[PDB]
Design a protein around this nucleic acid. Structure first.
Lengths: 757, 600, 476, 138
RNA sequence: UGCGAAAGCAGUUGAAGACAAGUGCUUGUCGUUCGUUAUAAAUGGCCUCG
């Protein structure tokens, strides 16, 4: 009956290799420069630049060869190497695949396989029929080897010939033309530049000669290189430091030139084709074009994130391609590819995948390097310790929630992600983002935080929900005070009511309540009201103190107001509260700590059994149908008939869910259809011979009262969230940012010739 | 929802046809027009006696009576008020059958007799509808003929449904148009269902269907709001118009125990998805959507009660939840007397709130999965424990902990399996019977920490364990759902300082300020004064409790002499509390000429 | 790139009435008894004072016509529906009809009675018939054509009749309210001279007004009551007034958020606004030097500046008014494609906002404490700097000379609840950051001594507030 | 934009005596006249005027004081004695009222805000005293 | 770092190798490893189109 299938996309792919800098971006612009090819973790998207839409999509799942192969793409080359819309994809392992865009994907592409002996392919490139490849072989520093690639027609094979070798490569970069390679090695350190197709350029010099003496006096940040760029001619080499100082070195005589604007570490450096301009970017969220003739600079500020990579992409520098990071989300690295028009510095094409915020960091994600160690960044020293600590936490520790809140708009079916201080509206049918809106005050895009400013925490959008009608949006926010003050511990809880007409795309804030429920008391739960009561224009908010507040929209006031309250000043605290409302609206089921209460809505007090005790704390209360109520506790789940007040089924959850999730996240793991039945989702770590990073999730469809299992499905990755679309199908979000769904003649010759001409 | 006590309308005559109680409801007809939510009048045709109109309120009274010969059987009756050619009039239409030889259709007009008319009907008259707007009388006959007449009984139109031996015909209005559906038995338990619309022909056939497996002989039928309900062998079959398709079958176990032949069953609707069911002298108000028994009432002073008609509430549009139902009641005794009675019925709000915990339908932990991943017999135990000799603590604890593999004397999350309430209750009963006095087993201490301690045993619990301090202390800290009444009584009765603070902490944690405050008023003035004297002799959970006392006691009840001592105490604490707050915050917190000595 | 966010710093019905800002107090020779507005543009209003009637221009707000022919005191200045004709009453009992804006000519003069004629009003639907009320207690109905005998003579009031009203949509109905406390309804279609029915007010009736076809509001004594003729009973009554209400006016379908407004004079110096939709509940009021005898507001179709006029027994007239390269202009009507990219400039930023945008933390703090700076605005810049994480940074390069402006405001801001918490944070840093400079600077020391006394005083208030809070719980 | 700000504590939708002047001002909603009565600071006058004020008018007086305090918090202190005596004197009458919080919602919110300052004001006071003690001895 | 409420309750911050500086010894560092749940500071601040 039911079936599982992936629907939407995932994160854009990057060359996630530590040493290579300035070559992180793999997307390419066609020779006609009419469309941009971007590889994703699960597909390849071809976007038309002129119209800013995804003209074509090549999904790995659809093609058998790509499905078996997909390992990550290390490069894309326009045309076919062996031989007008062909592309050659080189993966890290060595699979060379010739695909076609602008057409229908062929089920038998020209698959090949380069022969590498314990080598990981890192980069490939060409100038005119001559091809070289760079490969990685193994002090925590990887060494590199340079081969020459040629295709022999007779054997139809790729032959590799040794050309060069370098050891202990710390940092690397390739010129814009793709014919020079600059690299820093520990043979403290030395920089060497080599011509790649020729022997014309071959130079090396210690970094000590470049470094200023004052740097030798100062801390290590001054002597730490974070970025490196090499000019096409090889006459200039720009070195960027963690201090934020750029030094252009003239290779002929090693003369230095200091350019100092970046207050924090510079992350991206790139030369123009003629070499007269220098793109720089870093934590400032501002892209600076240094005019080297007069040392001037032009700025493009208030970008969406910190700039990881900069490039001038065109025969005449028509476009600038940037990679943005959005360091607010510590759980995941949120990359965004931005193609700007050089003429007027307007976004010609902005591309990014879904941006969920998980509870904790996942897999091997490491924050970018900064001048100082902060919550959003790592210092130079903190990197290795943080990596080791992350791996040890993922292995040894038992708290492995990685659960994210997501909402679905009933009217539009758009998918709302509560990013930190902002909401991302993402359309999973088209697999494109539709909006990004700031829903809080704070330092969000006023300026780029640097150094100690980076320790500030913007307001966090904790809960985001829609009414049944779908015309109102309720948002709950927590504002964190700055540190080192008397009022550095008094968090401010805010509730906001937003409204929006269907035609427009921007929500307009209508009411704002500061410190609802009192001062420093969280709104642990929110439940929009059913259609019966006030035509779905009311909501309930519940605390960790057992207090309940019912707000509704009054036409006379024209704004929301607190219609009802029950503020029992319980003396104990617990974040394990869940809340359900009957479809008719007569009764409200409030589960606090271990006890469930049935409150009559009219008097907003207990009915006149109302009290039901559970073995452990309640995580979720839901009523699949008016008759039956499913109650989940930390040790089990139970189905109760409200009519009989008796338990029908009880399923033990302790073996799988003991302390893996914090209280309240089982709510976002469990969802229920209003017609057919509910759905339970259980993730298990996979280990063979100590726990391993990889995870496996199981989804189980349950009928009302949980008598039978309609379906049992398994997915091969940790599923962060699962909810019920307003159609019969369920949508689940996976930590790979993947949204899957579980659901049920002479004239003819002359015409051809004229078309050719 | 509730059922009122029946009140007497009239006593039925002692006629032979009415002597057969089981068929008596068939001999009494209730007019549809006069019996509704807003009408205070009931027109009733008692076969062989008369057609009589009664007023219900303020007192039952006979307002009109039309006599009928004793040998005539009333087969159909209806009465409606309207304007006729214009004077306000009440048109009465009734059909009588005398020995099956002749069938009489009669129309009477009364000024609010203006005229009386009588014709011979071809067959038995079952349903009569009066259209005062068009001045028409419509009759349905047993030969399948639907005849339309004026108030002068002049035949204007006749429609043949092509089927004879009709058994059920009911009128209803939808969106302002008058509709009627008929059920005609066929052979082999097959029944023809037809739906007709009233507008060359004023009668239009909309649907005609044959339904299989539909028996009449033991089936009670009623219709309400596009749904036809059939009660048969304890199962209520719900059919939905216009196609009369079976939607739901609801089993009614309380009827399944009825021997076939002795129990008298009547079945009528009262509201949306709600009906009245009577079994002999017991009247049930049932909600069919939720399958719950909203209300039940037994009439001990009558042998049987049969529903005749009920004023049905359209609860979705009507804010009124009170209606009436009329039935025939039969007294116990050698000379039973059958009488007409009316019952006031409160249907309710039609919400799931009403049906909570009232179903008329009468566990073990199961693995989540039937079958390389990181991991994070109750009766036998009862029998073994019960077999023990009196006051044998060591054996009792050994069996309980060993058999259940319980490792700690207090409940832990690893003991989720024991959480079946039935086993815990029996062990608790065993512990009390097995042990009395001053020595209880350690199993009791484990149960006190169990989250699912039965509520039935919470009462008087603190008293039993008063003798042993540790066991009393355990009950305060961990025992669930302890009554507040006992906790407050023990609060003011215990002189132990430690227990008072724990009792203070427990009361606040589990109970609201409002809930606690009301009980505190009930406590004697002397006890609260004694508690106050104790204070004058974590502390906030005692003081905040005291602040509740000062609110409960009230302004008048407080006495000046003791109040001064309390004032001196509180002012003492405020000075100290301010002092400590200051300490806490503190913990959180060149010359032109200078003479110096040189070291050389 | 995105535009830089801008720094973020009563009832609508009240906000509308607050727009009558401009106030002019004119002095008349005697108490202004009656005030009327011309139904037609320019909607000039007439005021009856002493022996003259003065018409005031709406735009100019000054006298443009004066009718001084009257020998004794005048008692009315009501205009006709067309506005061409105005009628006035006199203590001698003569009713004089003049052409509006032509004071010299007297179109019609009628001797209603020997007793004073206090009320003279034109019948709203019918232009020809004019009603007059006199101390003779007969409210005669005159016609302009027939000046020798009234068309009809309504009688039955046992006390002075000083209030005549004509019901809209019922031209045959006539309403009279006497000092008997009885409001009498008459029908001119019948023989008349006998009321259809009487409504008891229990207090002398000072002015009767028909707000709508079925609702009449009768203001007498200390209260005004609204009566519905279909029910023939008072629906609602409001007695917020202290002195005896005198005059009352109604306007509907005007541009306010409230479609309708009802103004009633008090004789206590109060005139308050009531809206018929919300059960005739109070929304606004004005206070004057002395008792108010007459109040009027410009008609619905004023077509310009609205006016609110109040009449005082001292003769003071108070007016509040609610004021209401040959191809450069081508605009591309005939063109295939019009391309627009012009973006309006952002609203001018203040000095403090510019400094924050330019990362001038110290200068932004200085702009906070400058003479003539709003207290609310000073709070935002302080809150913004805290939010930006720049509190110590804004206070590093400072001495006693430039620290006193902050401490002076803190000395005053500590009292405010809104700024109490903010003052605590900034004061905590400066003490933790300038402990040594504190010792060597005397002036700073006294800035704390008074601060410690003031912060102590706030502690006493907050402790006191907790005590009233505690006992308030006991009552409930 | 034009959004209306609020707080969670808004429970709105859930000789020498001047008694005669006070009663007239309260009945007539006369803001000017009421202000003159509240101008007095002599505690003996405050008790006497409230002592002779009719119990019915006392309830609205608390409402007026609540609003005036909220607009201007500087007058929180001087107007508290007015409120303090109203509760003390008319306590019996106030008890016999069907509802208080709905009609005294503004008072409770206003009083709640002042108490919240007390924890932080002590913290500021301790640091002021710590530094104030320091240079005075030096 | 673990738990928990937000308050808080318990518990950590070790060893080796290499390099630099000063005088085999001392100190400091690590784009080095193993193990444990485990101040900053290169004068350096955000575009234009009214």
């Amino acid at each position: 009956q039911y079936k599982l299938s992936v629907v939407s996309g995932g994160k854009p792919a990057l060359n996630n290799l530590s040493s290579v800098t300035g070559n992180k971006n793999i997307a390419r612009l066609s020779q006609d420069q009419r469309n941009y090819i971007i590889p994703f973790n699960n597909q390849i998207k071809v976007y038309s630049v002129e119209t800013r839409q995804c003209v074509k999509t090549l999904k790995f799942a659809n093609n058998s060869l790509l499905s078996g192969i997909f390992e990550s793409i290390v490069k894309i080359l326009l045309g076919d190497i062996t031989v007008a819309h062909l592309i050659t994809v080189f993966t890290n392992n060595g699979h060379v695949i010739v695909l076609n865009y602008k057409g229908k994907l062929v089920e038998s592409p020209k698959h090949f396989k380069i022969s590498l002996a314990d080598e990981k392919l890192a980069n490939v490139f060409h100038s005119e029929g001559n091809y070289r490849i760079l490969t990685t072989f193994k002090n925590s520093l990887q060494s590199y080897r340079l081969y020459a690639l040629t295709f022999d027609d007779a054997k139809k094979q790729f032959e590799v010939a040794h050309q060069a070798e370098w050891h202990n490569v710390i940092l690397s970069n390739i010129s814009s033309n793709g014919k020079l390679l600059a690299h820093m090695c520990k043979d403290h350190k030395s920089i060497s530049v080599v011509s790649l197709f020729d022997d014309s350029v071959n130079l090396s010099f210690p970094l000590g000669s470049i470094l200023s003496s004052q740097t030798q006096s100062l801390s290590y940040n001054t002597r730490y290189v974070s970025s490196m760029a090499i000019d096409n001619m090889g006459q200039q080499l720009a070195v960027g430091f963690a201090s934020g100082v750029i030094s252009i070195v003239s290779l002929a005589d090693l003369q230095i030139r200091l350019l100092k604007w970046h207050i924090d570490s510079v992350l991206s450096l790139s030369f123009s084709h003629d070499g007269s301009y220098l793109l720089s970017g870093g934590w400032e969220k501002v892209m600076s074009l240094w005019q080297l003739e007069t040392n001037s600079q032009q700025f493009l500020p208030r970008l969406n994130g910190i700039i990881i990579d900069c490039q001038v992409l065109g025969p005449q520098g028509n476009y600038y391609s940037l990679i943005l990071q959005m360091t607010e989300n510590n759980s995941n690295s949120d990359y965004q590819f931005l193609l700007l028009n050089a003429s007027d510095l307007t976004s010609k094409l902005s591309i990014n995948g879904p941006l969920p915020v998980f509870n904790s960091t996942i897999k091997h994600i490491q924050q970018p390097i900064s001048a100082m160690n902060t919550k959003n960044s790592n210092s130079i020293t903190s990197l290795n310790h943080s990596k080791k600590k992350q791996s040890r936490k993922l292995i040894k520790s038992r708290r492995q929630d990685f659960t994210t809140n997501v909402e679905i708009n009933p009217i539009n079916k758009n998918l709302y992600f509560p990013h930190i201080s902002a909401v991302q509206i993402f359309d999973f049918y088209k697999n494109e983002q539709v909006n990004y809106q700031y829903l809080t005050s704070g330092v969000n895009n006023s300026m780029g935080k640097v150094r100690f400013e980076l320790n500030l925490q913007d307001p966090i959008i904790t809960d985001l929900k829609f009414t049944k009608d779908g015309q109102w949006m309720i948002t709950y926010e927590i504002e964190y005070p700055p540190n080192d003050l008397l009022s550095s511990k008094d968090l401010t809880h805010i509730l906001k009511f937003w409204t929006k007409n269907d035609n427009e795309t921007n929500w307009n804030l209508k009411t704002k309540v500061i410190n609802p429920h009192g001062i420093s008391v969280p709104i642990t739960k929110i439940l929009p009201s059913p259609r019966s009561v006030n035509n779905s224009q009311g909501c309930l908010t519940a605390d960790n103190n057992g207090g309940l507040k019912f707000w509704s929209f009054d036409s006379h006031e024209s704004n929301w107001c607190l219609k009802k309250i029950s503020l029992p000043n319980f003396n104990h605290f617990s974040n394990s509260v869940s809340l359900a409302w009957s479809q008719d609206g007569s009764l409200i089921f409030h589960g606090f700590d271990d006890k469930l209460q049935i409150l009559d809505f009219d008097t907003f007090k207990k009915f006149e059994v109302s009290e039901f005790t559970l073995d452990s704390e309640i995580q979720t209360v839901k009523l699949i149908n008016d008759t039956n109520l499913i109650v989940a506790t930390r040790t089990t789940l139970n189905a109760i008939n409200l009519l009989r007040g008796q338990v029908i089924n009880s399923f033990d959850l302790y073996p799988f869910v003991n302390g893996v999730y914090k209280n309240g996240h089982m709510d976002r793991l469990i969802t229920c259809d209003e017609r057919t039945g509910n759905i339970a989702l259980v993730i298990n770590q996979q280990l063979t011979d100590v726990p391993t990073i990889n995870y496996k999730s199981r989804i189980i469809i349950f009928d009302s009262d949980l008598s039978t299992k309609l379906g049992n499905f398994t997915h091969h990755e940790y599923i962060s969230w699962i909810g019920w679309n307003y159609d019969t199908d369920f949508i689940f979000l996976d930590i790979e940012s993947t949204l899957g769904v579980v659901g049920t003649s002479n004239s003819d010759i002359f015409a051809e010739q004229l078309h050719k001409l | 929802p509730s059922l009122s006590q029946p009140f007497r309308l009239a006593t039925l005559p002692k006629i032979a046809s009415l002597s057969n109680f089981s068929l008596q409801a068939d001999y009494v007809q209730v007019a549809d027009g006069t019996f509704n939510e807003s009408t205070n009048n009931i027109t009733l045709g008692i076969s062989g006696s008369s057609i009589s109109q009664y007023i219900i309120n303020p007192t039952p009274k006979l307002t009109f009576d039309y006599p009928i010969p004793s040998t005539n059987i009333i087969t159909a009756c209806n009465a409606e008020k309207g304007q006729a050619n214009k004077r306000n009039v009440e048109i009465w239409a009734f059909g009588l059958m005398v020995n099956k030889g002749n069938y009489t259709l009669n129309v009477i007009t009364k000024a609010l007799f203006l005229s009386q008319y009588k014709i011979k009907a071809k067959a038995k008259v079952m349903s009569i509808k009066i259209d005062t707007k068009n001045s028409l009388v419509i009759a349905i006959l047993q030969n399948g003929l639907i005849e339309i007449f004026d108030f002068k009984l002049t035949l204007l139109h006749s429609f043949d449904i092509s089927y004879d031996n009709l058994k059920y015909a009911k009128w209803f209005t939808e969106n302002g148009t008058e509709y009627v559906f008929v059920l005609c038995p066929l052979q082999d338990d097959k029944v023809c269902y037809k739906l007709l619309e009233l507008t060359s022909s004023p009668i239009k056939e909309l649907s005609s269907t044959i339904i299989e497996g539909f028996s009449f002989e033991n089936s009670k039928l009623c219709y309400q709001f596009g749904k036809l309900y059939k009660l048969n062998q304890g199962k209520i079959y719900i059919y939905s118009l216009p196609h009369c398709q079976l939607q739901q079958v609801i089993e009614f176990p309380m009827v399944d125990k009825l021997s076939p032949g002795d129990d008298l069953i009547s079945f009528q609707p009262v509201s949306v998805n709600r009906v009245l069911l009577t079994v002999n002298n017991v009247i049930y108000l049932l909600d069919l959507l939720h399958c719950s028994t909203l209300s039940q009432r037994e009439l001990t002073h009558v042998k049987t009660f049969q529903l005749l008609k009920s004023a049905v509430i359209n609860s979705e549009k009507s804010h009124n939840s009170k209606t009436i139902a009329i039935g025939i009641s039969t007294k116990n005794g050698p000379n039973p007397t059958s009488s007409l009675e009316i019952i006031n019925i409160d249907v309710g709000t039609n919400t799931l709130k009403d049906s909570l915990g009232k179903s008329f339908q009468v566990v073990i932990l199961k693995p989540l999965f039937d079958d390389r991943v990181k991991c994070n017999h109750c009766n036998e135990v009862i029998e073994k424990l019960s077999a023990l000799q009196d006051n044998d603590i060591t054996s009792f604890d050994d069996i309980f902990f060993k058999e259940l593999k319980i490792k700690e004397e207090h409940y832990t999350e690893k003991d989720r399996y024991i959480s079946d309430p039935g086993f815990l209750n029996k062990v608790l009963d065993l512990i009390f019977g097995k042990f009395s006095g001053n020595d209880y087993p350690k199993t009791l201490t484990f149960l006190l920490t169990h989250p699912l301690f039965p509520l039935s045993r919470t009462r008087n619990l603190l008293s039993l364990l008063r003798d042993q301090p540790r066991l009393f202390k355990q009950a305060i800290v961990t025992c669930p759902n302890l009554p507040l009444n006992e906790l407050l009584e023990e609060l003011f009765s215990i002189r132990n300082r430690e227990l008072l603070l724990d009792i203070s902490f427990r009361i606040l944690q589990d109970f609201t300020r409002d809930s606690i405050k009301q009980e505190m008023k009930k406590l004697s003035k002397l006890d609260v004064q004694n508690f106050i004297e104790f204070i004058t002799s974590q502390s906030t959970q005692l003081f905040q409790l005291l602040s509740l006392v000062l609110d409960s006691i009230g302004l008048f009840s407080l006495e000046g002499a003791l109040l001064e001592n309390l004032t001196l105490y509180i002012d003492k604490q405020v000075e100290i509390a301010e002092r400590n707050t200051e300490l806490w915050n503190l913990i959180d917190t060149l010359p032109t000429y200078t003479m110096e000595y040189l070291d050389i | 790139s995105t535009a830089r966010p801008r720094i973020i710093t009563t009832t609508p019905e009240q906000r509308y009435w607050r727009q009558y800002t401009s106030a002019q107090l004119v002095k008349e020779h005697n108490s202004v008894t009656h005030i009327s507005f011309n139904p037609q543009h320019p909607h000039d209003f007439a005021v009856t004072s002493s022996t003259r009637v003065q018409i005031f221009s709406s735009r100019t707000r000054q006298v443009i016509k004066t009718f001084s022919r009257f020998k004794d005191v005048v008692y009315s200045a009501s205009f006709r529906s067309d506005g061409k004709l105005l009628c006035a009453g006199d203590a001698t009992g003569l009713v004089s009809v003049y052409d509006s804006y032509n004071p010299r000519t007297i179109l019609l003069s009628i001797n209603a009675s020997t007793h004073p004629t206090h009320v003279t009003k034109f019948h709203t639907q019918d232009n020809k018939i004019l009603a007059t009320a006199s101390d003779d207690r007969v409210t005669r109905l005159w016609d302009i054509s027939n000046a020798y005998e009234p068309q009809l003579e309504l009688t039955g009031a046992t006390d002075y009749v000083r209030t005549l009203s004509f019901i809209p949509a019922a031209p045959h109905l006539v309403a009279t309210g006497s000092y008997d406390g009885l409001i009498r309804l008459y029908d001119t279609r019948s023989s008349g001279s006998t009321p259809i029915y009487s409504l008891n007010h229990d207090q002398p009736v000072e002015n009767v007004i028909a707000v709508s076809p079925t609702q009449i509001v009768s203001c007498g004594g200390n209260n005004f009551k609204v009566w519905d003729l279909t029910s023939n009973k008072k629906l609602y009554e409001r007695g917020n007034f202290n002195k005896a209400v005198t005059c009352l006016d109604y306007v509907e379908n005007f541009d306010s958020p409230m479609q309708s407004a009802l103004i009633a004079s008090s004789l206590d110096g109060h005139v308050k606004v009531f809206d018929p939709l919300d059960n005739f509940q109070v929304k606004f009021g004005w206070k004057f030097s002395g008792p108010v005898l007459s109040c009027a507001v410009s008609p619905s179709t004023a077509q310009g500046n609205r006016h609110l006029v109040a009449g005082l027994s001292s003769g003071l007239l108070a007016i509040r008014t609610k004021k209401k390269m040959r191809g450069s202009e081508y605009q591309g009507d005939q063109e295939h494609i019009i391309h627009n990219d012009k973006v309006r400039s952002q609203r001018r930023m203040r000095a403090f906002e510019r400094n924050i945008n330019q990362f001038k933390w110290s200068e932004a703090l200085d702009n906070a404490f400058v003479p003539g700076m709003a207290k609310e605005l000073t709070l935002t810049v302080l809150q913004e700097l805290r939010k930006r994480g720049k509190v110590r940074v804004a206070l590093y390069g400072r001495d006693e000379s430039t620290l006193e402006p902050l401490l002076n405001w803190c000395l005053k801001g500590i009292e405010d609840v809104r700024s109490a918490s903010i003052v605590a944070d900034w004061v905590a840093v400066v003490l933790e950051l300038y402990g040594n400079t504190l010792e060597s600077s005397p002036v700073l020391q006294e800035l704390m001594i008074d601060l410690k006394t003031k912060v102590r005083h706030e502690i006493h208030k907050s402790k006191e507030a907790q005590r009233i809070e505690g006992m308030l719980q006991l009552l409930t | 934009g034009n959004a209306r700000v609020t707080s969670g504590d808004n429970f709105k939708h859930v000789t020498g005596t001047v008694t005669v002047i006070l009663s007239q001002a309260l009945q007539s909603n006369d803001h000017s006249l009421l202000e003159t009565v509240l101008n007095n600071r002599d505690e003996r006058v405050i008790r006497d005027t409230i002592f002779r004020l009719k119990p019915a008018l006392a309830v609205i007086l608390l409402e007026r004081l609540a609003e005036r305090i909220a607009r201007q918090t500087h007058r929180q202190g001087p107007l508290n004695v007015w409120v303090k005596w109203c509760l003390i004197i008319h306590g019996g009458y106030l008890v016999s009222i069907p509802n208080l919080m709905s009609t005294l919602s503004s008072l409770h919110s206003t009083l709640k805000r002042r108490s919240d300052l007390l924890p932080r004001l002590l913290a500021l006071d301790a640091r002021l005293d710590c530094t104030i003690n320091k240079f005075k001895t030096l």
